[PDB]
Amino acid sequence: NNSVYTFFMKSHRCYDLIPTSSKLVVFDTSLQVKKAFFALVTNGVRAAPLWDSKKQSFVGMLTITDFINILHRYYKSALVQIYELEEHKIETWREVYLQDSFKPLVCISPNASLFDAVSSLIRNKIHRLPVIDPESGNTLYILTHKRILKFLKLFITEFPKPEFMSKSLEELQIGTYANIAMVRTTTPVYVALGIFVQHRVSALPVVDEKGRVVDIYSKFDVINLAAEKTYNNLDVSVTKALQHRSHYFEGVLKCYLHETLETIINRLVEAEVHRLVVVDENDVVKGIVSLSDILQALVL
Amino acid sequence: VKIGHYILGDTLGVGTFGKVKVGKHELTGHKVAVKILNRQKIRSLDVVGKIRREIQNLKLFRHPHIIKLYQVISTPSDIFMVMEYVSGGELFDYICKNGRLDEKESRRLFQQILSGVDYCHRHMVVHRDLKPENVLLDAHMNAKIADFGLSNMMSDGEFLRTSCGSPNYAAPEVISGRLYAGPEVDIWSSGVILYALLCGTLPFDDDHVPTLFKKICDGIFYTPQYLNPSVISLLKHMLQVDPMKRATIKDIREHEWFKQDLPKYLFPNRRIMNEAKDFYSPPDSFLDDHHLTRPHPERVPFLVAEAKWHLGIRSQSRPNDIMAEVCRAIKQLDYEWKVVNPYYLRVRRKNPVTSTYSKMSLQLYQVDSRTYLLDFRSIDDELTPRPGSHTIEFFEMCANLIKILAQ
Amino acid sequence: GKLVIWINGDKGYNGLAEVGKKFEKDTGIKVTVEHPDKLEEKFPQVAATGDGPDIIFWAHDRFGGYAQSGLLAEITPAAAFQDKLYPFTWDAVRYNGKLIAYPIAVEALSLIYNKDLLPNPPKTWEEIPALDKELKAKGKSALMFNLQEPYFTWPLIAADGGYAFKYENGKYDIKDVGVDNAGAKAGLTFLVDLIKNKHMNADTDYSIAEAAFNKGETAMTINGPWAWSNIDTSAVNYGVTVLPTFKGQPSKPFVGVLSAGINAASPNKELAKEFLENYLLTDEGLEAVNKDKPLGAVALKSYEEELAKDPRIAATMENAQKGEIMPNIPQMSAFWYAVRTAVINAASGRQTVDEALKDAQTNAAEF
Amino acid sequence: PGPYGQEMYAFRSAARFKSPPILPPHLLQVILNKDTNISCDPALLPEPNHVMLNHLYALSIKDSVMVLSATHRYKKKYVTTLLYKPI
Ligand SMILES: Nc1ncnc2c1ncn2[C@@H]1O[C@H](COP(=O)(O)OP(=O)(O)OP(=O)(O)O)[C@@H](O)[C@H]1O
Ligand SMILES: Nc1ncnc2c1ncn2[C@@H]1O[C@H](COP(=O)(O)OP(=O)(O)O)[C@@H](O)[C@H]1O
Ligand SMILES: Nc1ncnc2c1ncn2[C@@H]1O[C@H](COP(=O)(O)O)[C@@H](O)[C@H]1O
Ligand SMILES: OC[C@H]1O[C@H](O[C@H]2[C@H](O)[C@@H](O)[C@@H](O)O[C@@H]2CO)[C@H](O)[C@@H](O)[C@@H]1O
């Protein structure tokens, strides 16, 4: 089990993980929110390290979870209240947001091992882990779960493949199987956002009257509101919001409990998604797996 | 002369700086080529660093088609560089002696050469002067590149001002005193060499020197029926007068003619990244016959729901006027400068929170007769691991400038 | 408008200035004097282009390669001046039938020995390692000279029967190479047996021997007429005697001549080179010898009768009679650098004695 | 090794009539305005040229904020850093 994976993640450093040429942005704390948000769709990136001009350090990170938080927390009506949050600032939301708890910015040197990176990932429950060189002080890349799992599966070869392939997904008991948070396809976005902010969930697979997953509602999908200027109205359902790509998506990416973990991770790196909803012949949703759970299993 | 075991033979040539001779080992009879740089003659000129930036470089280089510097021995009489000596002599005497060459030979040689000059480009050196008289041949009649006197060192984000070399083989851009990058002038001298290796005659030839520059700056050249159109294409695209439309080592690599009959011992964690990580150039043929594509999941709302990056600051005014305005505003900002050239500055600030210092360079350009451009270039820090961001301190210095310069 | 004169570091700038003051008062122009290190390489850099200084002070021999280049100026002798001033010195400065240099001083090396300690000076090279064997019981040393310059070291190498060049007649063979012979083998082998037996330190250069001699830490060094001005500041009572012989055959010190060679300038008069300089030589040369340093070997009999009263001058004479005048040909320059490289390679362990001699012969043949 | 006459005050203009340097066309080639592939990644970029790296590529100031970027080199890795900083 841990004979080959832990060794492979301790011997290789984070430097090799970084791609050759990439585009990265950073934000200032004096900037306003809505500006940076409208910018995040035009630039194609969803995350940015915050830089405060006065403190001369990296104060934090800006992801789409912050977008979701500010949208849910400050929302009264759907057409005449939207004034207040337009003029809001990044450092002002930073100051009011850390009234409840003080969570600083975490970073890892790219010379350190991959094991320490995925250790920071799990132990702080953060998907976006910057790498900052100690000498130059520059923020090279933002490490992600998806990259590390694609690099684990693609690199491995049949002669170093473990003996752990034989066990099936069911019997191994990996994932959250008890409390599956769901929403209906006629429920608005607002409640899904509530469920996002209150729980630790990364997406919701929407269900019909029977309980068959026809689509999914991701925390990344919400930026299309800020792209098509439809963030004003949150009363509409998630079917109205996902209608934009109804001509484009192929289908629901899903696996079973009787398949092998090999084929599951290969269809996961081949579809490049965050999860595979496990269903049955009925298509009722028993449990949801995550990338983070797979990484946690791999490290130990 | 003799240093260790070599008795000099016959004088080969006059060389760039000093003459070159042939050593001969006293017991086995090995033949080396010894470059004699006369001490007096190079100390007269200021070139004493230009030789250094050759000596530094040629100590590292090892390539089977590049002439390998063995050792450099310095003594108050003169400087000695020992290199491998080949029997076949210079290329222009085989061009002369054999006239025009067929495709198999010219091809093979051009591949060996191009592979050399790639190997050089990658290690951040560019040798300006390319001509058959600077490149030799061995007993196996391969391609050897000898003369490296007129070379230079490639620095990060630094163009080249010095234009030298043969009058026929000098690039169209360098003859008009223009700043230029190292790879394309080499590629263009490669392409005129390749032309010479096929027809026998120079592509741009004339006795009158001003007419020659005009003929170089013009893109027209003779295209015989001696060879297939693939090479004609490859030359037209390789010898383009526009450096933006001039091919690169890649662009030549994936060309049809070039691939044919190519032994692979020319081009050599890096390879793991190359294969699997990169998959994670647009093909023209695939686009025409395929209407189905698989978009990355991060992009999929953008091409369903569907920005011009300027070079820098442009203000149309007098050069001295704008530079005086800039030197007044950088002083108003209480920072400090030095000037090397009247249009060049090296400026630095001190960190307010730490005791460290950050630097950068300013060079004013001209986009055209009506408008100028003011460029902003960053630098490196040699030694200390500083707990601060170079890139951000640079951007903030540039911002604090541009704010006072606009408003 | 300003005359720059580069001078060697052993020379004194103040003495030259005192001689120049009389000319300076009449002219009204002041002369700057500097001493740049390694003046061997500093003159032919600017001489090939005509830059920088005006007058160079240096030995005559390395002008015979400057002249072969064509850099040096040309002068013509005068019948009424050449005969009266000097009987024979013209021979030494006559290149291709034309004078190229002004002979100033006949110079030769000599032994400068302590009188209070080691009261009797040696006269042979064969009792010097036995005098060091005797003096390494008291804590002193016999001979400690510069082993980096071959001007001092040659007369020990060439004393056993090793000759680079024969000048019995004008004819000579360029093909024949003669420094790997028996004499030079025994003399380099005997100096490597002097270094290996811990008699002589192989790290002393000109500076170390000059600081050890100006302070009186070494009893003997072969330097010349300079350091006597520094012995007068030292307590050591001293004498000047003939260089030691070897197997009966005396040592052969080379005969340098300090010369002043005009450097290139954009205007150059032809009359100034000969007519003006001849008048200067009579006054500039006579006064310099009288004021500071007695050279003792001058070609004017009037001030020779006064200088032949010093027995140190007759010791320099009795050296210079037993020696060999240096050929003025330029290849002797390419000989000088050969010999220096014989004496630093055998002493550093990079090369053996046989290898050093073979290397010197190859340098003569192949340069 | 170039001499410069006066620093505190401007004594006289340069003796040369014209000394402007003309922009080479290698800094006009911007990598951000290049449209990347749809299928690979919005984050990645094609490989830039070693010359144009250290120079600064400023986006036009639109709404009271500055928008600047630079491509910084590392050992075997290139990165493009964008900063949006308000005035
Ligand atoms: N199980 C699934 N079934 C159907 N569609 C899915 C599934 N998982 C993800 N998707 C679709 O894939 C898209 C991207 O999902 P994902 O969260 O993996 O992207 P991401 O958040 O950009 O990646 P990362 O988690 O690395 O940031 C979403 O728009 C979603 O519609
Ligand atoms: N490196 C970090 N250090 C501290 N907090 C972070 C970091 N990255 C993100 N956060 C915070 O954690 C929340 C969730 O971030 P993350 O899980 O990385 O992105 P996402 O939720 O979009 O996957 C964000 O609201 C952000 O404020
Ligand atoms: N939609 C979900 N329903 C239930 N649990 C989830 C869901 N999404 C994520 N989790 C859990 O949250 C943990 C980390 O979440 P994440 O990092 O966002 O993948 C995992 O261990 C999961 O069990
Ligand atoms: O040692 C080589 C050197 O010997 C002589 O140089 C003498 C010079 O003549 C003196 O004036 C004084 O400077 O001491 C020098 C030796 O250190 C030769 O004249 C010279 O050509 C030769 O290089």
Pick from C331, C127, C346: which is nearest to C247 by CA? C127
Cα separation, B401 vs B392, in Å, equals 14
- The identity of residue A281, as a single letter, is E
- My answer on whether A129 and A231 are in the same domain is no
Whether residue A275 is annotated as binding a ligand: the answer is yes
Cα separation, B216 vs B192, in Å, equals 11
Cα separation, C317 vs C295, in Å, equals 11
Question: Using an 8 Å Cβ cutoff, are C154 and C183 in contact?
Answer: no
Cα separation, B335 vs B333, in Å, equals 6
- My answer on whether B125 and B203 are in the same domain is yes
Stated resolution in angstroms: 5.5
Pick from C343, C319, C320: which is nearest to C111 by CA? C319
B222 in any annotated domain: yes
A176 lines ligand 3 (CB under 6 A): yes
CA distances from C37 to B273, C214, C224 (A): 58, 20, 19
- My answer on whether A43 and A168 are in the same domain is no
Pick from B376, B327, B381, B384: which is nearest to B358 by CA? B381
Sequence-separated contacts (24+) of B317-323 with Cβ below 8 Å: B317/B372, B319/B343, B319/B364, B319/B372, B319/D19, B319/D20, B320/D13, B322/B364, B322/B372, B322/B374, B323/B364
- b or e along B89-106 (b: 16 or more beta carbons within 10 Å of the residue's beta carbon)? ebbeebbeeeeebebeeb
DSSP label at residue A186: T
Cα separation, B42 vs B45, in Å, equals 5
What interhelical angle do C353-366 and C331-348 show, nearest 10?
A: 160
Domain boundary pick from B230, B259, B288: B259
Angle CA(B199)–CA(B200)–CA(B204) in degrees, nearest 5? 85
- My answer on whether B221 and B351 are in the same domain is no
- Determine which helix (DSSP H) or strand (DSSP E) holds B196, and give its type and residue range: helix B182-199
| D34 CB within 8 Å of a chain B CB | no
- Alpha-carbon dihedral C56, C60, C64, C70, rounded to 10 degrees: 30
- My answer on whether B121 and B203 are in the same domain is yes
Whether residue A147 is annotated as binding a ligand: the answer is no
- My answer on whether A38 and A115 are in the same domain is yes
Strand partners, A208: none
Give all strands (DSSP E) within B4-154, no chain letters: 20-24, 31-38, 69-74, 78-84, 89-90, 125-127, 135-137, 144-145, 151-153
Pick from C142, C144, C151, C138: which is nearest to C122 by CA? C142
CA distances from C21 to C15, C29, D25 (A): 10, 10, 65
Pick from C18, C36, C31, C61: which is nearest to C327 by CA? C61
Strand partners, B153: B125
The CATH code for residues C111-252+328-366 is 3.40.190.10
> CB distance D78–A20 less than 8 Å?
yes
- My answer on whether A12 and A115 are in the same domain is yes
Whether residue A64 is annotated as binding a ligand: the answer is yes
- CA of C68 from ligand 4 middle (Å) equals 20
- Alpha-carbon dihedral B77, B82, B86, B87, rounded to 10 degrees: 30
| Non-local CB neighbours of C14 within 8 Å, separated by 6+ positions | none
- My answer on whether A28 and A69 are in the same domain is yes
Half-sphere exposure of C160 (CA within 13 A, CB side): 18
The burial of B185, by beta-carbon neighbours within 10 Å (0-12 exposed, 13-18 middle, 19 or more buried), is given as buried
What interhelical angle do A261-271 and A145-155 show, nearest 10?
A: 120
DSSP label at residue B368: E
**β-pairing verdict for A129-132 and A48-52:** unpaired
Characterise B187 by phi-psi region: left (phi > 0), alpha (psi -120 to 50), beta (else). Answer: alpha
Q: Which residues of A touch B297 (CB under 8 A)?
A: 272-273
**What ligand 3 atom has the least distance to the C-alpha of A181?**
3
Domain extent, residue B75, equals 20-84
- My answer on whether B142 and B76 are in the same domain is no
Helical H segments across B290-368, by residue range = 302-305, 319-332
Closest CB from B7, B39, B41 relative to C362? B7
- Alpha-carbon dihedral C124, C128, C131, C132, rounded to 10 degrees: 170
List the subunits that have 3+ CB pairs under 8 angstroms with A.
B, D
Which is catalytic among the residues B46, B102, B118, B129? B129
How far apart are the CA of D78 and the nearest CA of chain B, in angstroms? 12
| D30 CB within 8 Å of a chain B CB | yes
- My answer on whether A132 and A11 are in the same domain is yes
A148 in any annotated domain: no
Cα separation, A127 vs A144, in Å, equals 6
CA distances from B167 to B197, B206, B246 (A): 18, 10, 20
| Non-local CB neighbours of C216 within 8 Å, separated by 6+ positions | C234, C235, C236
- Touching, A vs C (3+ Cβ pairs under 8 A): no
Angle CA(B378)–CA(B382)–CA(B387) in degrees, nearest 5? 80
| A56 CB within 8 Å of a chain B CB | yes
Rounded to 5 degrees, φ, ψ at C80 are -80, -20
How many beta-carbon contacts under 8 Å exist across A and D?
Answer: 77
What token pair was written down for A82? 């939207």
Cα separation, A238 vs A252, in Å, equals 16
How far apart are the CA of C190 and the nearest CA of chain B, in angstroms? 24
- My answer on whether B143 and B48 are in the same domain is no
Cα separation, A19 vs A140, in Å, equals 10
- CA of A274 from ligand 1 middle (Å) equals 5
Residues of chain C with CATH 3.40.190.10: 3-103+256-291, 111-252+328-366
SS3 B263: coil
Pick from C220, C206, C199: which is nearest to C151 by CA? C206
Rounded to 5 degrees, φ, ψ at B369 are -55, -25
- My answer on whether B240 and B330 are in the same domain is no
| Non-local CB neighbours of B130 within 8 Å, separated by 6+ positions | B117, B165, B169, B186, B189, B190, B193
Q: Is B368 a catalytic residue?
A: no
What token pair was written down for B402? 């541009």
SS3 B105: helix
- Look up the CATH number of the domain holding residue A255: 3.10.580.10
Residue-by-residue DSSP string for A221-248:
TTHHHHHHT--S---SBHHHHHGGGTTT
| CATH architecture for the domain at C3-103+256-291 | 3-Layer(aba) Sandwich (3.40)
SS3 B380: coil
Cα separation, B175 vs B189, in Å, equals 13
B294 in any annotated domain: no
| D64 CB within 8 Å of a chain B CB | no
- CA of B296 from ligand 1 middle (Å) equals 10
CA C46 to chain centre: 24
Tell me the torsion sign for CA atoms B238, B241, B245, B249. Answer: positive
A30 in any annotated domain: yes
Domain boundary pick from B45, B65, B84: B84
Which residue's CA is minimally distant from atom 5 of ligand 2? Answer: A105
Experimental method of this PDB entry: X-ray
Rg (CA), chain D: 19
- The identity of residue B241, as a single letter, is V
Cα separation, C270 vs B65, in Å, equals 58
> CB distance A26–D82 less than 8 Å?
yes
| Non-local CB neighbours of A245 within 8 Å, separated by 6+ positions | B300, B301, B304
Cα separation, B143 vs B95, in Å, equals 13
Angle CA(C146)–CA(C151)–CA(C155) in degrees, nearest 5? 100
Pick from A92, A88, A30, A33: which is nearest to A55 by CA? A30
Domain boundary pick from B212, B236, B259: B259
Tell me the torsion sign for CA atoms D26, D30, D31, D34. Answer: negative
State the CB neighbour count (10 A cutoff) for residue A199. 11
Rg (CA), chain B: 26
Question: Which ligand is nearest the CA of A126, by number?
Answer: 2
Question: Using an 8 Å Cβ cutoff, are C113 and C91 in contact?
Answer: no
CA B372 to chain centre: 26
- Look up the CATH number of the domain holding residue B78: 3.30.200.20
Cα separation, C55 vs C33, in Å, equals 10
**Which residue's entry shows tokens 């008048």?**
C279
- My answer on whether B221 and B130 are in the same domain is yes
How far apart are the CA of B128 and the nearest CA of chain D, in angstroms? 17
Q: What is the 3-state secondary structure (H, E, C) of chain C?
A: CCEEEECCCCCCHHHHHHHHHHHHHHHCCCEEEECCCCHHHHHHHHCCCCCCCCEEEEECHHHCCHHHHCCCCCCCCCHHHHHHHCCCHHHHHEECCEECCCCCCCCCCCEEEECCCCCCCCCEHHHHHHHHHHHCCCCCCCCCCCCCCHHHHHHHHHHHCCCCCCCCCCCCCCCCCCCCCHHHHHHHHHHHHHHHCCCCCCCCCHHHHHHHHHCCCCCCECCCCCCHHHHCCCCCCEEEECCCEECCECCCCCCCCEEEEECCCCCCCHHHHHHHHHHHHHHHHHHHHHHCCCCCCCCCHHHHHHHCCCHHHHHHHHHHHCCCCCCCCCHHHHHHHHHHHHHHHHHHCCCCHHHHHHHHHHHHHHC
State the CB neighbour count (10 A cutoff) for residue B362. 21
Cα separation, B172 vs B191, in Å, equals 13
Terminal CA-to-CA distance of chain D, rounded, Å?
39
Half-sphere exposure of B114 (CA within 13 A, CB side): 27
Domain count, chain A: 2
Domain count, chain B: 3
What interhelical angle do A114-124 and A291-299 show, nearest 10?
A: 130
Question: Using an 8 Å Cβ cutoff, are B15 and B134 in contact?
Answer: no
How many beta-carbon contacts under 8 Å exist across B and D?
Answer: 149
| A41 CB within 8 Å of a chain D CB | no
Domain boundary pick from A111, A143, A175: A143
Question: Which ligand is nearest the CA of A98, by number?
Answer: 2
Domain extent, residue A195, equals 163-299
Strand order across the beta sheet in which B89-90 lies: B89-90, B135-137, B144-145
Pick from C295, C300, C304: which is nearest to C281 by CA? C300
Pick from C64, A27, A154: which is nearest to B277 by CA? A154
